[PDB]
Ligand binder design. Structure first.
Ligand SMILES: [Mg+2]
Ligand SMILES: [Mg+2]
Ligand SMILES: [Mg+2]
Ligand SMILES: [Mg+2]
Ligand SMILES: [Mg+2]
Ligand SMILES: [Mg+2]
Ligand SMILES: [Mg+2]
Ligand SMILES: [Mg+2]
Ligand SMILES: [Mg+2]
Ligand SMILES: [Mg+2]
Ligand SMILES: [Mg+2]
Lengths: 68, 84, 140, 142, 100, 58, 141, 72, 206, 8
RNA sequence: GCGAUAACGAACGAGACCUUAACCUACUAAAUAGUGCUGCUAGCAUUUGCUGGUAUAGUCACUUCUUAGAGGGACUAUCGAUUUCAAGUCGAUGGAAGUUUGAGGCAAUAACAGGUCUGUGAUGCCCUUAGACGUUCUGGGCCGCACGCGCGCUACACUGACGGAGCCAGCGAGUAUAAGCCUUGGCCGAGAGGUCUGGGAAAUCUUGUGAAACUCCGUCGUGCUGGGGAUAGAGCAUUGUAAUUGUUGCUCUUCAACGAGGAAUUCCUAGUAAGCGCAAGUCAUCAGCUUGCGUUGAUUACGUCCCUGCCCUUUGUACACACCG
């Protein structure tokens, strides 16, 4: 299965809480941006964080989210 | 061939030196609690992120036992255990 | 030089390298005509990339493939893949893209393995059994 | 080509005091003859000029006698020595090929010739055990 | 002029590729024609033992490995130049063999 | 006298071992008489499996 | 177009070159052809006793034509097969050396092959001419 | 066992073949063995001769299967 | 229809194949139609193939098997009983001969006969067991369209295998007889006896 | 497991 | 994980991580990889073509395939459904890859009288220590056979046996003055094998490991038959100091049960199962064994707690050596 972990859920919502103006709805741009925002040790983990920041953006664009 | 001898820089971070010191203390009749905690505190004083001392065997009793003396933060699984 | 495109097709281990030069309708497998590809029952597997689009596309081109590795069927699939990809790459590079997109459309709509190599490979065998998933019979 | 015949076929043949089915191919009817295998019968038939495409009943008497002649005198018809059944015989040292009735006789004579000297192989033959050094843990249940 | 083959072997790839690049650079800025490096197929030294020292338990096996990486570089240069390149780039991990 | 019934909802796995599935069928003709029935093989929505007898629930 | 040996199916090419070599008749057949087995793994001699040697020479000639300086050890490996070991699993065993070497020596003195440099046996200047000829009189039907 | 298929062709059986084989929708080795009671080898030789005699047309040729039909 | 002259000569039959793709270049899919609505979506004949020897990738998702060609599913189910696993080329050769025998006998489209025997051979009601931990209990339940097809394919090849086992009649013509007979609904055939006994028990269980 | 007894 | 919440915020384990497999006509090069051209050269039609050979100087070019390092690529990406619209799940589309992308390595808190002192110049203690329980030499045994059980290999055939013919891999290993390594080719020999040379401390030679299933054409024709090759006789060689109680190989002959297997019971979800071989380990010799590797390659679910084992909650306890109480 593909249930994201807490190390990606919290790192993505920290990204959301800190760099919302610079983010976008494009995965490639979010992926490059988090490569210049965070020091991530592995590319695969980098892709998981950018994929969840994109998912969170699509959910904020669909309405207000609780807790962020 | 040429041999040079160099002193180990970080006494708290070298497990070989700490193990030799523990062996020389257990062989000197020192109590188990004082010997184990002397390296637990020496490692932390040197700045180690974590330390674990396990002593197993028989001590004045027919039945054998093992004692763990942990301290700080320690990781167990995966590559970082091979790295750190 | 001249009009030359070079490609390759792959199956499990078999790999066929195809050279497509400008010439007559010559289509060879390791220097041999396609009318005698073995095994016989699969000769239409390598006949498929030609008669499906129509053989007129091969008037102006000559194809020489070199297939090594794998087994008999894996080599048949490697040759037919190398042929289909070589023809597409030639149209894409030295002919109008209308022909290349028509060929890619018919090929993909008919069979996916014609242009994209199948990624399935053999699983390693693991101890405790005679196969990848099979295990030694247990007794109580 | 397909050919037909009437009255020439012999339904039951008798070779070396053994009844041989006449509708079997000649090579395997002689393979029915004890002491004559497929490898030996192909060669005695080629030395006797009996074409293998004939059934046993198809065969004539002249060829049948030429076959029993080959079977009884093999070395005289350029059959190689290494191809024979019983080579370097114990008593007279000559190359032989024993046949239907001679086979069990000389096999017997070999068993008694070994038991008289009371060798281990003869002992295990007497006991009915495996004699060639085989394990008897799981197979001596007959 | 002198046709020289240099064989580079090691267990770890980081230092092997560092030495290889440093030597190619010094054979580049010095106008010496070179052929290489040719990346030889890496050798996997595999040993598969049983985990259990006794013969009790589930039949589990360890499989240790020791990868050996090999590069060969061809140089056309005098021996003084080649020896001083070797001494500039001497490294404990990587072994070097020079053959004429 | 076979009757054909379109499925509109897969209810859930039933039976002791879970090898049979409850499904809600609707008749192709006379789009009424909706029935709950059990089916053995794997089922998606829009499977037209036919029924020998209709007047029985499951 | 120029027809070659590689342009004809093997089965009827070998049956045709074998037929030509038999009717032509100059190939010399060793005296043990009625006795021997092709391989130690085989259990019976070839069923077509009179013509098997000719067919084998035709196969050897075509195979060497399509390849380069194959030795007799390689031909033994090529024509060897699975041995019928009783209860143990099957294994590959080479064909007879004498049979292959005699076939190639007879064909070498009839003019189709010769000893190649750095080992093996190339196909002759006339070996190509007459194999391609047989191919031409092979594909008209 | 119980088979006892005929392997030798007499004249009565020969003419039985030439009188019965023409009235067949599909002839092969097994149909001939099953219903004409002849052996397999004799069936194979019968097919190879019946084609030369024109009674049977070979639709498809293979070693393990020989598919033939009536020529009428 | 024009014959295209190449330096490498191409046979006449394969040159007729640019107009149409036919199974083994002999049988056309154009005139084939399923005379039953319930198996149309699960017997795949819309995409023609030349040889039934195709690739896999159809054993991954749930209803992906319905997209595999029906003839390739038949030759896949044919290769059973251990000694035949992996002998796909042998299975394809036997099936290829079987279609010819089905064509020479009774004179119709052979792949129409295979489809008819498969639509006519899958039982529509099966009696599943509902035993509560040992006790004997049976309940009649329906069979999904996918299972009807793949039980038809299982029964035709099982019946052909057993009719050709230890019998002089060859497997290709045992499959041909089984397919034609099941196509015409005769109760003499296996997979019609099995289907009747199954649907009979299902009638005696509801 | 056994007691070695001598003869010579 | 969402969510509910006297809890909030954390750590280990899981996951991350590491190795391997699948993509890259995008970098970097490669005479220990391949190709196209070019010399020189052969055969067939003569159409200038098609197949070859040769080139450690043609003192050519290139990296598509081959190798391996630096990177890129997948994160459930996009679109539809269901869902607390949440975590997720199911379909398509794009994609090399959309089952944790496939497979493994590592792997928590305690613990077991689980297995090894027959791995240790690891060890405490007990026994022996000169007619040794030390070490060495000779011979026998570990193989011994009324029997019960387990892991497997051959088979019961025609989806097959022989006889010819076709004819494709990958993982690896390899020596020197040794004490004998991998062995091509030529020549003898029915075979096994013998003899003379050459290559390799190795992407170079063994090796294109021309492996087996597999494919084609023939013989056989449902027969314990040409399935099966045990049980044995005779003979010929190989390894070794030594083959007898037959090391193994080869020739002829001998032609057994077995005609698909009761009660029970094992393994298994995709290049998987099943066939099919090959290498490495032990190794002077011997592989029906393991560890890997590739060749051919499926049927059927993608669900449940019906059996079995384990886990959780409530509950009762006179148990805590914990119901073997
Ligand atoms: Mg982990
Ligand atoms: Mg397997
Ligand atoms: Mg004498
Ligand atoms: Mg072979
Ligand atoms: Mg062969
Ligand atoms: Mg995993
Ligand atoms: Mg120990
Ligand atoms: Mg076991
Ligand atoms: Mg065969
Ligand atoms: Mg063992
Ligand atoms: Mg309580």
């Amino acid at each position: 299965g593909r249930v994201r972990t807490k190390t990606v859920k919290r790192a993505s919502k920290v990204l959301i809480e800190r760099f919302y103006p610079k983010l976008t709805l494009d995965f490639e741009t979010n992926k490059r941006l988090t490569s210049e925002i965070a020091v991530i040790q592995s590319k695969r983990l980098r892709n998981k964080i950018a994929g969840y920041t994109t998912h969170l953006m699509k959910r904020i664009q669909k309405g207000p989210v609780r807790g962020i | 061939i040429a041999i040079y001898a160099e002193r180990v820089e970080e006494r708290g971070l070298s497990a070989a030196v700490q193990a030799e010191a523990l062996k020389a203390k257990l062989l000197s009749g020192l109590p188990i609690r004082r010997a184990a905690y002397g390296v637990l505190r020496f490692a932390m004083g040197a700045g180690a992120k974590g330390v674990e001392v396990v002593i197993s065997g028989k001590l004045r009793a027919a039945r054998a036992k093992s004692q763990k003396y942990a301290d700080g933060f320690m990781i167990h699984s995966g590559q970082p255990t091979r790295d750190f | 030089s001249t009009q030359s495109v070079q490609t390759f097709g792959k199956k499990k281990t078999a790999t066929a390298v195809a050279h497509v030069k400008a010439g007559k309708g010559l289509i060879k497998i390791n220097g041999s005509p396609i009318t005698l590809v073995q095994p016989e029952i699969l000769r239409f597997k390598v006949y498929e990339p030609l008669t499906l689009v129509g053989l007129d596309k091969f008037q102006g081109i000559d194809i020489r493939v070199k297939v090594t590795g794998g087994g008999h069927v894996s080599q048949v699939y490697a040759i037919r893949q190398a042929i289909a990809k070589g023809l597409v790459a030639y149209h894409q590079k030295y002919v109008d893209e209308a022909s290349k997109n028509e060929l890619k459309k018919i090929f993909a709509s008919y069979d996916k393995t014609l242009l994209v190599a199948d990624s399935r490979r053999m699983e390693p065998k693991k101890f405790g059994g005679r196969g990848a998933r099979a295990r030694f019979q247990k007794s109580y | 080509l397909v050919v037909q015949e009437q009255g020439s076929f012999q339904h039951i043949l008798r070779l070396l005091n053994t009844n041989i089915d006449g509708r079997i191919k000649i090579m395997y009817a002689l393979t029915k003859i004890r002491g004559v295998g497929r490898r030996y019968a192909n060669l005695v038939c080629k030395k006797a000029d009996v074409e293998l495409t004939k059934r046993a009943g198809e065969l004539t008497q002249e060829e049948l006698e030429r076959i029993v002649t080959i079977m009884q005198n093999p070395t005289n018809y350029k059959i190689p020595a290494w191809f024979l059944n019983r080579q370097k015989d114990q008593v007279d040292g000559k190359d032989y090929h024993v046949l239907a009735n001679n086979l069990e006789s000389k096999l017997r004579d070999d068993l008694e010739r070994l038991k008289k000297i009371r060798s281990h192989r003869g002992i295990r033959h007497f006991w009915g055990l495996k004699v060639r050094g085989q394990h008897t843990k799981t197979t001596s249940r007959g | 002029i002198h046709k020289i083959r240099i064989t580079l072997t090691s267990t770890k790839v980081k230092q092997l590729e560092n030495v290889s690049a440093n030597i190619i650079r010094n054979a580049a800025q010095y106008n010496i024609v070179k052929k290489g490096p040719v990346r030889m197929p890496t050798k996997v030294l595999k040993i598969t033992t049983r985990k259990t020292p006794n013969g009790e338990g589930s039949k589990t096996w360890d499989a240790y490995e020791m990868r050996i990486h090999k590069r060969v570089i061809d140089l056309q240069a005098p021996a003084s130049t080649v020896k001083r390149i070797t001494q500039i780039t001497i490294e404990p991990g990587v072994d070097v063999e020079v053959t004429i | 006298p076979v009757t054909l019934a379109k499925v509109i909802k897969v209810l859930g796995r039933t039976g002791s071992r879970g090898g049979v599935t409850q499904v809600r069928v609707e008749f192709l003709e006379d789009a009424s008489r909706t029935i709950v029935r059990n089916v053995k093989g794997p089922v998606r929505e829009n499977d037209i499996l036919c029924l020998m007898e209709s007047e029985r629930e499951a | 177009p120029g027809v070659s040996v590689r342009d004809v199916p093997a089965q009827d090419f070998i049956n045709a070159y074998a037929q030509f070599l038999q009717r032509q008749g100059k190939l010399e057949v060793p005296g043990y052809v009625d006795i021997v087995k092709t391989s130690a793994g085989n259990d019976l001699p070839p069923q077509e006793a009179e013509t098997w040697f000719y067919k084998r020479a035709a196969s050897i000639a075509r195979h060497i034509y399509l390849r380069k300086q194959v030795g007799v050890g390689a031909l033994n490996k090529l024509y060897g097969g699975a041995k019928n070991r009783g209860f143990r699993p099957h294994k590959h065993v080479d064909a007879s050396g004498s049979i292959n070497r005699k076939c190639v020596q007879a064909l070498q003195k009839i003019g189709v092959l010769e000893i190649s440099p750095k080992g093996g046996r190339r196909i002759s200047e006339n070996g190509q001419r007459d194999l391609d000829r047989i191919a031409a009189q092979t594909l008209e039907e | 066992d119980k088979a006892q298929h005929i392997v030798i062709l007499d004249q009565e059986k020969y003419d039985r073949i030439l009188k019965d084989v023409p009235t067949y929708k599909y002839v092969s080795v097994s149909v001939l063995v099953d219903r004409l009671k002849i052996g397999g080898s004799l069936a194979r030789v019968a097919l190879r001769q019946l084609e030369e005699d024109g009674i049977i047309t070979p639709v498809l040729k293979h070693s393990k299967q020989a598919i033939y039909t009536r020529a009428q | 229809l024009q014959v295209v002259e190449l330096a490498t000569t191409i046979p006449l039959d394969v040159q007729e194949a640019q107009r149409e793709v036919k199974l083994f270049n002999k049988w056309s899919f154009e005139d084939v139609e399923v005379k039953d609505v319930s198996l149309v979506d699960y017997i795949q004949i819309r995409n023609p193939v030349f040889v039934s020897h195709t690739a896999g990738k159809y054993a991954s998702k749930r209803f992906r098997k319905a997209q595999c060609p029906i003839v390739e599913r038949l030759t896949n189910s044919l290769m059973m009983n251990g000694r035949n696993n992996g002998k796909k080329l042998k299975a394809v050769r036997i099936v290829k001969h079987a279609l010819e025998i089905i064509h020479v006998l009774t004179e119709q489209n052979p792949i129409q006969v295979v489809v008819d025997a498969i639509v006519n051979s899958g039982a529509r009601e099966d009696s599943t067991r509902i035993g509560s931990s040992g006790t004997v209990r049976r309940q009649a339940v329906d069979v999904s369209p996918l299972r009807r097809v793949n039980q038809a394919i299982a029964l035709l090849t099982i019946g052909a295998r057993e009719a050709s086992f230890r019998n002089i009649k060859t497997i290709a013509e045992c499959l041909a007889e089984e397919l034609i007979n099941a196509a015409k609904g005769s109760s003499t055939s296996y997979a019609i006896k099995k289907k009747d006994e199954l649907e009979r028990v299902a009638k005696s269980n509801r | 497991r056994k007691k070695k007894v001598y003869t010579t």
